[PDB]
Design an enzyme around this catalytic site. Structure first.
Site, mmCIF file in Angstrom:
data_model
loop_
_atom_site.group_PDB
_atom_site.id
_atom_site.type_symbol
_atom_site.label_atom_id
_atom_site.label_comp_id
_atom_site.label_asym_id
_atom_site.label_seq_id
_atom_site.Cartn_x
_atom_site.Cartn_y
_atom_site.Cartn_z
ATOM 1 N N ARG D 37 35.812 28.095 30.892
ATOM 2 C CA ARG D 37 35.471 28.480 32.284
ATOM 3 C C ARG D 37 35.716 30.011 32.388
ATOM 4 N NH1 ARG D 37 37.432 27.161 37.786
ATOM 5 N NH2 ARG D 37 35.851 28.832 37.985
ATOM 6 N N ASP D 70 43.982 25.278 34.882
ATOM 7 C CA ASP D 70 43.607 26.687 34.651
ATOM 8 C C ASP D 70 44.404 27.376 33.585
ATOM 9 O OD1 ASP D 70 41.586 26.486 36.753
ATOM 10 O OD2 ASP D 70 43.255 26.751 38.174
ATOM 11 N N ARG D 71 45.665 26.972 33.360
ATOM 12 C CA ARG D 71 46.563 27.816 32.612
ATOM 13 C C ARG D 71 47.332 27.003 31.630
ATOM 14 N NH1 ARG D 71 47.024 28.750 37.665
ATOM 15 N NH2 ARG D 71 49.027 27.611 37.569
ATOM 16 N N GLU D 196 41.685 39.553 44.584
ATOM 17 C CA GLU D 196 41.655 38.827 43.345
ATOM 18 C C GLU D 196 40.312 39.021 42.666
ATOM 19 O OE1 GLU D 196 42.356 34.723 44.321
ATOM 20 O OE2 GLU D 196 44.557 35.124 44.064
ATOM 21 N N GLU D 197 40.276 38.901 41.345
ATOM 22 C CA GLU D 197 39.017 38.721 40.614
ATOM 23 C C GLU D 197 37.928 39.739 40.937
ATOM 24 O OE1 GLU D 197 38.414 34.530 41.549
ATOM 25 O OE2 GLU D 197 39.711 33.939 39.887
ATOM 26 N N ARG D 212 37.694 39.101 45.821
ATOM 27 C CA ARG D 212 37.944 37.860 46.531
ATOM 28 C C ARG D 212 39.274 38.042 47.289
ATOM 29 N NH1 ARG D 212 38.928 32.193 43.146
ATOM 30 N NH2 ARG D 212 40.085 31.041 44.721
ATOM 31 N N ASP D 213 39.199 37.968 48.612
ATOM 32 C CA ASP D 213 40.396 37.841 49.499
ATOM 33 C C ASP D 213 40.631 36.363 49.607
ATOM 34 O OD1 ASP D 213 42.086 37.378 51.713
ATOM 35 O OD2 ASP D 213 41.389 39.152 52.842
ATOM 36 N N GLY D 217 40.051 36.212 54.192
ATOM 37 C CA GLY D 217 38.694 36.742 54.356
ATOM 38 C C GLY D 217 37.560 35.890 53.747
ATOM 39 N N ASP D 244 31.874 34.976 50.547
ATOM 40 C CA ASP D 244 32.843 34.103 49.921
ATOM 41 C C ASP D 244 32.461 32.624 50.023
ATOM 42 O OD1 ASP D 244 34.941 33.476 48.173
ATOM 43 O OD2 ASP D 244 36.443 34.666 49.191
ATOM 44 N N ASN D 266 41.493 30.057 50.137
ATOM 45 C CA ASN D 266 40.558 29.577 49.187
ATOM 46 C C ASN D 266 39.497 30.634 49.017
ATOM 47 O OD1 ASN D 266 39.382 27.764 47.318
ATOM 48 N ND2 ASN D 266 39.286 26.113 48.857
ATOM 49 N N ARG D 290 30.844 25.037 45.968
ATOM 50 C CA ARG D 290 30.198 25.911 45.025
ATOM 51 C C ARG D 290 28.891 25.307 44.548
ATOM 52 N NH1 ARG D 290 35.885 27.365 41.681
ATOM 53 N NH2 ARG D 290 36.709 28.593 43.433
ATOM 54 N N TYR D 324 31.828 30.798 39.691
ATOM 55 C CA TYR D 324 32.152 32.217 39.706
ATOM 56 C C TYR D 324 30.888 33.010 39.438
ATOM 57 C CZ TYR D 324 37.267 31.849 39.722
ATOM 58 O OH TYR D 324 38.583 31.676 40.062
HETATM 59 CA CA LIG Z 1 38.330 33.704 50.928
#
Ligand SMILES: [Ca+2]
Ligand SMILES: *[C@@H]1O[C@H](CO)[C@@H](O[C@@H]2O[C@H](CO)[C@@H](O[C@@H]3O[C@H](CO[C@H]4O[C@H](CO)[C@@H](O)[C@H](O[C@H]5O[C@H](CO)[C@@H](O)[C@H](O)[C@@H]5O)[C@@H]4O)[C@@H](O)[C@H](O[C@H]4O[C@H](CO)[C@@H](O)[C@H](O)[C@@H]4O[C@H]4O[C@H](CO)[C@@H](O)[C@H](O)[C@@H]4O[C@H]4O[C@H](CO)[C@@H](O)[C@H](O)[C@@H]4O)[C@@H]3O)[C@H](O)[C@H]2NC(C)=O)[C@H](O)[C@H]1NC(C)=O
Ligand SMILES: *[C@@H]1O[C@H](CO)[C@@H](O[C@@H]2O[C@H](CO)[C@@H](O[C@@H]3O[C@H](CO[C@H]4O[C@H](CO)[C@@H](O)[C@H](O[C@H]5O[C@H](CO)[C@@H](O)[C@H](O)[C@@H]5O)[C@@H]4O)[C@@H](O)[C@H](O[C@H]4O[C@H](CO)[C@@H](O)[C@H](O)[C@@H]4O[C@H]4O[C@H](CO)[C@@H](O)[C@H](O)[C@@H]4O[C@H]4O[C@H](CO)[C@@H](O)[C@H](O)[C@@H]4O)[C@@H]3O)[C@H](O)[C@H]2NC(C)=O)[C@H](O)[C@H]1NC(C)=O
Ligand SMILES: *[C@@H]1O[C@H](CO)[C@@H](O[C@@H]2O[C@H](CO)[C@@H](O[C@@H]3O[C@H](CO[C@H]4O[C@H](CO)[C@@H](O)[C@H](O[C@H]5O[C@H](CO)[C@@H](O)[C@H](O)[C@@H]5O)[C@@H]4O)[C@@H](O)[C@H](O[C@H]4O[C@H](CO)[C@@H](O)[C@H](O)[C@@H]4O[C@H]4O[C@H](CO)[C@@H](O)[C@H](O)[C@@H]4O[C@H]4O[C@H](CO)[C@@H](O)[C@H](O)[C@@H]4O)[C@@H]3O)[C@H](O)[C@H]2NC(C)=O)[C@H](O)[C@H]1NC(C)=O
Ligand SMILES: *[C@@H]1O[C@H](CO)[C@@H](O[C@@H]2O[C@H](CO)[C@@H](O[C@@H]3O[C@H](CO[C@H]4O[C@H](CO)[C@@H](O)[C@H](O[C@H]5O[C@H](CO)[C@@H](O)[C@H](O)[C@@H]5O)[C@@H]4O)[C@@H](O)[C@H](O[C@H]4O[C@H](CO)[C@@H](O)[C@H](O)[C@@H]4O[C@H]4O[C@H](CO)[C@@H](O)[C@H](O)[C@@H]4O[C@H]4O[C@H](CO)[C@@H](O)[C@H](O)[C@@H]4O)[C@@H]3O)[C@H](O)[C@H]2NC(C)=O)[C@H](O)[C@H]1NC(C)=O
Ligand SMILES: *[C@@H]1O[C@H](CO)[C@@H](O[C@@H]2O[C@H](CO)[C@@H](O)[C@H](O)[C@H]2NC(C)=O)[C@H](O)[C@H]1NC(C)=O
Ligand SMILES: CC(=O)N[C@@H]1C[C@@H](F)[C@](F)(C(=O)O)O[C@H]1[C@H](O)[C@H](O)CO
Ligand SMILES: CC(=O)N[C@@H]1C[C@@H](F)[C@](F)(C(=O)O)O[C@H]1[C@H](O)[C@H](O)CO
Ligand SMILES: CC(=O)N[C@@H]1C[C@@H](F)[C@](F)(C(=O)O)O[C@H]1[C@H](O)[C@H](O)CO
Ligand SMILES: CC(=O)N[C@@H]1C[C@@H](F)[C@](F)(C(=O)O)O[C@H]1[C@H](O)[C@H](O)CO
Ligand SMILES: [Ca+2]
Ligand SMILES: [Ca+2]
Ligand SMILES: [Ca+2]
Lengths: 388, 388, 388, 388
Positions: D37, D70-71, D196-197, D212-213, D217, D244, D266, D290, D324
């Protein structure tokens, strides 16, 4: 173009960062991954690669049955790209055999593989991917070598071999090669009583090897080699922090010139970096089996028979399998110092996990940081149940 | 850059060391390994590779059924990295066909593949990976060539072909190529009565080929070629150590200019190095089938009709399958002499192992050492039962 | 380094020799071979490769179901090494789409892929593996191109496209590219009434394309392009030896400037070499379906409306499946003349073999010889039953 | 040879053409495709490649179970050839970890991977495929970075990292690297409340990042970086076209200096190109999940709080899964302007498709055209049912 010279000192080791990891047993559950053991890492001037001894079958292949065995005609030294797994399609054969070493001298690579029956083994020394020199067994009892990279200085690449008993005195020799040719060899000297599987690194024109005394010692023997004079000496790590496996509990005072007793006829390949206060030792966490792995900062371990840890880092949890470990560095990196690196072999399957009929491993490797980095643990990650 | 010249003599052969081994049938039990036969080894100036004739299917593929057959439209000369297996993903096609040879002249490589029906076959001669010359069948009976590497000198690469009966007189020709073009060809001369599958090597500006007399001889015919004059001669190996298969028991005195009788219409590709006292012969251990393989030092085998072994080495045990064998050398190695090398094809499956529907092989290869090295045996290593 | 110029004439074509064959469907029965169709061959200055349109699934994959369909978002132009199969692991994507062409100009390669829905398709023109130019649909009805290599002269690479009806008049354009940029385009001129899938070759500074009149003609249209003037003309092959498929039986006199009637709204991509007495035509053997393949020497086919065969060669038997066919040459070969080459696509699976749910192909390719070589036939070789 | 400088402006974006597509989940149904991913695309001076985070198992492998997470210690940044899938055999490991970025500075490539447990993560910065710098977690809460390419100017490659809460204030830093060494870092400034990102691109010596907030946001924060002064600022995209996901319905007037409220805690990684009237925004079509993907031309989106779409293009239908998305350009292409490009990650499997136990993705990517091209939609194309 020129032979590399060991002109730098070690960087300061304040922690260890992740360098590579192949996840080979996880991936090999459903892809054409070769069964291996006795892995290591070695750098060329333009690339670093993983190395190991193949068993000449894939892990899901029916020929994986029986691969607990160390020495067969189906084994070969292979190399492959860093953090890829050792696949049938991406693995390059360096030479044929069941004990090996390999190193780059700055111009090209020397690889050594030993093959044969126990009483009639021979080493072939390859240089620039061609055979150059051959060496016949001198004691007729499993001629064998480092199982991790050698080190060169101005073209001279010393290599440690042992032939003879694994459980009694044996005949260890240090060969000094250049362009694959023998310049000289010497019988082992100093106070080490038994040597196997030396793990070596180079700095400031000296090569240091941390080895395995399989016969008596739970402290590790150390060989220090001057590749210009082509002489060496030997001793044990003085520290009471004992780094073989299996081993007794740690005492308060170690031994500098004798094996530290308490376990006989067994051991594991391991390593250390011995650089005064910048000294770090690797070991299994378990005293009884090859589980877990940790790095301990033990100032002056080589010379101080009461030295104890001032810092550490967990690499593999004691609830996960480890295995052989060894040293390498990228001698061709930029900057003012050589960055210490190591790998740990993560053995899966037999004998500890005997629901499968195979034995294989994956690899994890780290290098030093001058930061004080956070630690994770790095297990193999495969579920044995998937293979049933 | 320049055409290679055969300026060196053979190194002294005191034993044989392991060079390469692909373990292809073992690995191919669970990976995408192509079915092959008629393998060999050939070097470029910067790499040595394995070669063989693919059958255009994998071994676990259902199209492996029927691969005992020698000649189909699905065959091709392939090459792959030394000691890797011949996989779908790493094998490079040199040309299309069911009989081949290949050699590097120091500037680039010539590869020859013959295809077609039995009565209308043709050779295509590729140079620098492009087709250059074509040669049509002259006797309308399976035009065919060496199945191992050719040899070049100052650009001239002779090649031996045969067209005609496998069990009676045939028409053998020696073609002298340069840059893929025909300089000259000659009909076979001398006392060899039948020629197939020449195995060749070069030293001191002469090329020596040890071939298979399929019609009558259990001694091997030898062709010696002067690539400067573009002339040749032929005879048989004089020695009573007989090296074809199948064959009668060894006599006390051999034949220099005639086939040694006792078996008709059969044989196997083989080789020798004929260098006075430095003479070594390969053969199957069995007189009846392609099992086992050994090397015998037979001083003056070529010229002494009573020469017998003074030394030897077992390569494959008589309880393991062998097959074709041939010569190659690394003409671009460093040093003062050319190191003799050979391969043995390890045939598995049909006809001897008829529980499987396929026939394939793996490869083992050795080169000479000036040491007296310990010997191992080197079997294919696959378990047929796994394939059932 | 320099743009290639078409300075040579065709070599004399006396027969055809085998050049490459991938056996992809045979091999793909048990290996990760991509489903393809619309293959071709194209050379760089240092390598020749196979090209095709992938369907974005392997043949044994469940997504192979439905691959009779021509146009999806999962298709791409791929290339791979000559005579290897198109595998997941060795195939390089040139661009994304469902109609393509590609050629090397002597400095680097131009590749063109068209994608989109039927009424809104676009071409992207890649040069040196970067997109450079885009061209939108002009008639909103399946913008489409050659499906075999283009040809360049001094940097100018003409390409034929068609947009519009497959069963009625359409709008065909000749684009003249250089470095991926449009120098000029022209609407089709001359007497060809419908153009698709041009197969092109270059000699003596002229490019000749043999195409498919899908609407009415069973004779093939020919476009001749002067890449210096950037002009062209068109006509049909005059010969009564008809080379489309399906087609009526051959008459005694053909048509030079009109379609030869008898079949409508159907055809197959094909080719020819039109070089006076050195003229060779390819065709399916069957008049009704894509089976068999043969080459006929038809002197002056282009200009003589009664020309008939003086020689021929069977490539694929009428009991085996054929498919699209096209021309290419190695413009960078050594010597005094360009050697004519062609491929034939060997379609397997649907619609003719409907026990499988897929459609794919393999490739066979030949080049001309100045010898009169023996002929074999070259089928795909896969057994459909194995895939059930 | 020289560090690349951002000397060009953006090309005019009139539509988007297909650039690459790997069809990885379709192909991986029956081939050794790694689960991934967080993919992206990044160019070197001579090649563009796909990048992603592997999960260290194949998709058909039993270890694919659990890959919604994810990790883990089994993740690595891998790269592979453009439009090929990420296979075990063709994927190159750049570094080990579970958050990454990568970019080429014109001389060589910098790659950054972060690993560790949530409260003790570290970044390792690799340059010329060697580790150079390490950075320890500063807030002990999932140190993390862009998940798409960084951008360089005269050797200076800024990178945005965040450590701290995903659902509240966090500590974001901009590091300015050169040759893998830290020149400087700054804490986030301006009016962005959470980062982020970041997805970044370079033109006319300024780097623009759309991020990305995650906290508050549904409009995207924008960071603009001057890589010469090594300073930056931040704001949000002013436009009421909200980009977003998930998000509220679009209003008539947006917010320039605050998060646009309506969804908390999110988001999804996304991008834009902000170039006055030449401004294009990407977004999911669904406000809730998405699904789908579209590009909207929104003149002056960055600065006009009432800007609405003047043109658009559907990339993925709302009935297909997206994921993404991020920006990249080929900084080494020929011509007078940089051609805007982007990718969209097509997520398959969990959580939306929970009949499988895995989560993976494929990739689609486009670049801008100065033509007004026809649009297609570009779904992943795999049938989940095949995997049951
Ligand atoms: Ca957001
Ligand atoms: C985020 O990551 C951070 C970085 O990794 C991490 O911080 C690290 O935390 C680890 C785990 O705590 C530390 O590793 C240990 O380090 C010990 C040495 O440090 C102590 O002793 C020094 C000297 O007296 C002190 O200077 C030092 O104080 C300083 O640092 C402190 C931070 O830890 C700080 O609070 C202080 O203010 C001060 O600044 C500190 O007190 C080291 O001794 C220890 O190893 C032993 O313990 C392990 C078990 O935990 C064993 O596995 C290991 O083998 C060692 O014990 C065994 O061997 C000894 C020697 O013979 C024996 O004496 C012991 O009895 C024991 O022997 C048994 O077990 C053996 C193994 O099984 C066996 O063979 C024997 O037979 C016998 O059975 C460990 O390495 C690390 O240094 C920290 N690093 C840093 C930079 O701080 C942080 O925790 C992470 N954060 C979070 C939030 O998770
Ligand atoms: C560690 O590795 C070491 C290196 O490999 C290994 O030592 C090697 O040992 C092997 C096996 O013994 C040796 O190979 C043999 O060599 C024989 C020739 O050497 C003898 O004869 C010489 C001349 O008269 C002597 O000089 C020589 O003496 C010297 O060396 C001795 C060491 O071996 C030493 O003790 C002495 O002091 C001295 O210095 C020695 O006596 C060779 O003849 C033999 O081949 C025959 O035998 C094989 C069966 O074993 C057959 O397979 C083979 O085909 C040969 O016999 C067949 O063919 C002959 C010729 O026609 C016939 O006359 C025979 O009757 C027989 O024919 C039958 O079988 C045929 C095949 O099936 C068939 O076709 C016929 O029809 C008929 O049916 C073998 O090659 C090797 O030389 C040793 N190498 C070295 C350097 O020493 C050592 O053993 C290993 N160590 C351990 C501990 O395992
Ligand atoms: C070893 O390999 C050798 C090399 O390959 C091989 O020799 C080759 O043999 C093949 C097969 O015989 C030859 O191909 C044919 O060539 C024919 C043309 O040659 C003839 O005609 C010339 C002019 O009148 C003569 O010069 C020529 O004579 C010379 O050469 C002779 C050797 O063959 C020699 O004996 C003489 O001494 C002399 O020197 C010779 O007579 C060619 O016409 C033929 O193609 C037709 O036939 C095929 C069926 O076999 C069809 O598939 C093909 O399409 C052609 O027929 C169709 O089309 C024609 C044109 O319209 C129609 O007139 C026909 O009626 C027919 O039409 C039907 O079928 C169509 C297709 O289905 C259809 O569309 C129509 O609608 C209609 O239904 C064939 O190509 C080749 O040239 C030989 N090559 C060489 C160098 O000799 C040798 O045999 C092999 N050896 C062994 C031992 O196996
Ligand atoms: C062949 O390919 C051609 C090229 O792709 C293709 O033509 C393209 O067609 C598409 C689809 O129609 C066009 O995309 C749209 O463009 C809209 C903007 O263009 C309009 O508005 C302009 C300004 O007022 C006008 O200038 C413009 O007129 C010009 O062009 C016309 C051609 O289309 C022509 O006829 C005229 O003569 C003139 O020259 C035109 O009127 C754009 O607005 C639209 O996006 C909205 O609609 C989508 C749904 O279709 C949404 O998914 C999207 O998100 C946008 O709407 C949402 O967001 C808005 C902004 O906030 C809100 O106001 C809306 O209410 C809506 O919000 C809801 O949905 C959101 C998403 O789910 C949600 O988040 C909100 O919460 C809310 O729920 C779309 O992009 C494209 O520009 C055309 N391109 C070209 C070059 O012509 C042609 O059709 C193909 N041909 C064939 C035969 O198939
Ligand atoms: C990007 O801009 C820099 C700074 O102007 C250029 O750097 C100079 O490069 C030349 C030629 O290689 C050197 O001799 C100078 O020493 C460099 N530095 C400076 C500060 O002037 C660089 O070449 C430009 N990059 C490209 C691709 O042109
Ligand atoms: C991988 C593993 O579970 N190792 C354990 C750790 C520990 F529980 C231990 F007691 C230990 O040795 O410290 O046993 C190990 C292992 O189960 C045995 O030692 C050998 O089976
Ligand atoms: C591979 C193998 O088992 N070969 C044997 C060796 C031997 F027992 C022998 F008698 C021999 O020929 O020397 O038979 C072989 C083989 O079984 C037959 O010759 C052919 O099946
Ligand atoms: C591949 C194949 O069998 N083709 C045959 C050849 C012939 F028998 C023929 F009659 C012909 O067309 O000449 O039918 C073909 C084929 O079966 C049909 O034409 C289409 O199914
Ligand atoms: C891939 C897909 O089916 N997406 C749908 C589109 C639409 F129907 C929608 F209502 C939407 O969000 O616009 O639901 C999506 C999806 O089913 C849910 O949003 C999440 O499951
Ligand atoms: Ca010990
Ligand atoms: Ca014989
Ligand atoms: Ca037609």
């Amino acid at each position: 173009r020129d032979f590399n010279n060991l002109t730098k000192g070690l960087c300061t080791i304040n922690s260890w960062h992740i360098y590579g990891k192949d996840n080979a047993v996880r991936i090999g559950e459903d892809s054409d991954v070769l069964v291996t053991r006795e892995p290591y890492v070695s750098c060329d001037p333009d690339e670093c690669r993983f190395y190991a001894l193949s068993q000449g079958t894939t892990i899901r292949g029916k020929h994986s049955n029986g691969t607990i065995h160390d020495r067969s005609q189906y084994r070969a030294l292979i190399s492959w790209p860093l953090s890829s797994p050792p696949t049938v399609y991406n693995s390059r054969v360096e030479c044929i055999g069941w004990s090996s070493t390999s190193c780059h001298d700055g111009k090209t690579r020397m690889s050594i593989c030993i093959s044969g029956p126990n009483n009639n083994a021979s080493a072939v020394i390859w240089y620039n991917r061609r055979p150059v020199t051959e060496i016949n067994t001198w004691a007729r009892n499993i001629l064998r070598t480092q199982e991790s990279e050698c080190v060169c200085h101005n073209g001279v690449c010393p290599v440690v071999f042992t032939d003879g008993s694994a459980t009694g005195p044996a005949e260890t020799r240090i060969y000094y090669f250049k362009e694959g040719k023998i310049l000289k060899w010497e019988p082992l000297a100093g106070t080490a009583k038994h040597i196997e599987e030396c793990s070596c690194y180079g700095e400031r024109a000296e090569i240091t090897c941390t080895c395995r005394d399989n016969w008596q010692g739970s402290n590790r023997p150390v060989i220090r080699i001057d590749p210009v004079a082509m002489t060496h000496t030997s001793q044990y790590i003085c520290s009471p922090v004992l780094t073989d496996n299996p081993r007794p509990n740690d005492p308060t005072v170690g031994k500098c010139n004798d094996p530290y007793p308490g376990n006989n006829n067994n051991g594991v390949k391991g390593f250390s970096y011995l650089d005064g206060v910048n000294t770090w030792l690797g070991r299994t966490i378990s005293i009884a089996s090859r589980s877990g792995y940790e790095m301990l900062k033990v100032p002056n371990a080589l010379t101080d028979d009461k030295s104890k840890p001032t810092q550490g880092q967990t690499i593999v949890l004691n609830t996960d399998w480890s295995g052989y470990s060894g040293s390498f560095m990228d001698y061709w990196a930029e900057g003012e110092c050589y960055r210490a690196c190591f790998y740990v072999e993560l053995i899966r399957g037999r004998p500890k996990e005997d629901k499968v009929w195979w034995t294989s491993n994956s690899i994890v490797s780290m290098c030093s940081s001058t930061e004080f980095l956070g630690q994770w643990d790095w297990p193999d990650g495969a579920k044995i149940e998937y293979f049933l």
